[PDB]
Amino acid sequence: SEINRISDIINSDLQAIADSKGTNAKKVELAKISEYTFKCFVFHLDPFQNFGISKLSKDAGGGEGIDWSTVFKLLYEGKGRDLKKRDKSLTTLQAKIINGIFDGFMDWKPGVKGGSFLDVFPDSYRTFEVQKCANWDPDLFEANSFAQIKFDGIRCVAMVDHNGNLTYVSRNGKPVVNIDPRIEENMKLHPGWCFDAEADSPANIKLTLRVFDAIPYDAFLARKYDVQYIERYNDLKSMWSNNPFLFDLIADHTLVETWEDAQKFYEDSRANGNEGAIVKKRFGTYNFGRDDSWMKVKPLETIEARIIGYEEGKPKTKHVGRVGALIVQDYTGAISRVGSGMSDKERQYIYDNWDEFENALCEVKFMERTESGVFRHSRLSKIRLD
DNA sequence: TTCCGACAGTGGGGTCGCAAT
DNA sequence: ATTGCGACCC
DNA sequence: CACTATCGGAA
Ligand SMILES: *P(=O)(O)OC[C@H]1O[C@@H](n2cnc3c(N)ncnc32)[C@H](O)[C@@H]1O
């Protein structure tokens, strides 16, 4: 049984990367990993893999051992539940490595994830990247940009390959279902194109799309396309001009000469009941990442709340022994959890001097209230007040 | 010397499908 | 059948 | 969807 030789090289590789300090030194050690350590990293990082479980039983393993090929086979097929039923026939080191596949090797903390792994080992697994927006900042505004409604719903990319076959995928490449069938029927007439849109109810009932970008299928897969925004927009309008059904799906935009015009558009959009606005530079290219070619304008409320509780950092995290999240209440009676906005030192102070905070007032920033009345996207702005 | 892009590591509110009751 | 938790939305 | 923290090259 070659099991214990493989569990040792895996445990040795993870410890070697964790002991390396700095990003550069961690990547040169990542290049030296074995076949088996490579496979476990792929199993944890692959965004299109699932296992059905997040941890084995606390019965752990305890001697014996299972063939590493059998383990990798069970993980690849998504049979995590079957693996857990046989978990005590694993060795303890095996169960520690497998639990590390699920939670990210927290026992070792090597400090390398998808960014470092794909840099050292390109194309080890498939990823999905779309254009994302940076935060609104007038200092970065480019003159004569275009303002657009930030539509409600979910991000949805529609890709029509060269055979005319279409798939709807989400922001992270997962399938999207129940789109109006007229939409697929008409888009199949434009093979070799990907359309960036938002899916939402026209108001179960089938969703419709608001399309705001279009990229050729090959350029989309290559993650490279140098046509600027306004030309990309006009190209979409012309290729759909003869199809009125598709043409009406195109989202409108408004020229904003100055950043104060963009702010005015955002306020008009808020007055009409929309979430906010997106500002798009007329010279910006689709970059398949996050940059200021797109910038989002979203509301942000500020309120004073009373700390009424706390929760320690979850097991094996860097926040063990200090505050992971605060429990706050405001004047409406709503109770919301705040998990970010505090420095590491502030998390430790509150944990120790809990008398200073048990019912004191703090300042919380959030986007809006949910339908239940609690905060959406809450964050702490001030631990104490002056 | 500092600024910042890239990256790793935390956390929240909500919906839905399916395995295990 | 319901319950819960994995897996994904924002 | 958020914020903090750290490396290490750009500024
Ligand atoms: P987040 O608050 O970071 O905002 C980005 C997402 O907003 C959605 N969205 C709505 N409307 C648009 C337009 N017109 N253009 C681009 N993105 C839009 C997307 O789903 C983004 O992921």
Residue numbers in the entry: 10 to 212, 229 to 411
From the reporting publication:
DNA ligases are enzymes which join breaks in the phosphodiester backbone of double-stranded DNA using an adenylate-donating cofactor: either ATP or NAD+. The ATP-dependent class of DNA ligases are widespread in biology and are found in all archaea and eukaryotes as well as a large number of bacteria and viruses. Here, we present the crystal structure of the ATP-dependent DNA ligase from Rhizobium phage vB_RleM_P10VF (P10VF-Lig), which has substantial structural similarity to T4 DNA ligase as well as to the ATP-dependent DNA ligase from the cyanobacterium Prochloro­coccus marinus (Pmar-LigP), despite having low overall sequence identity to either protein.
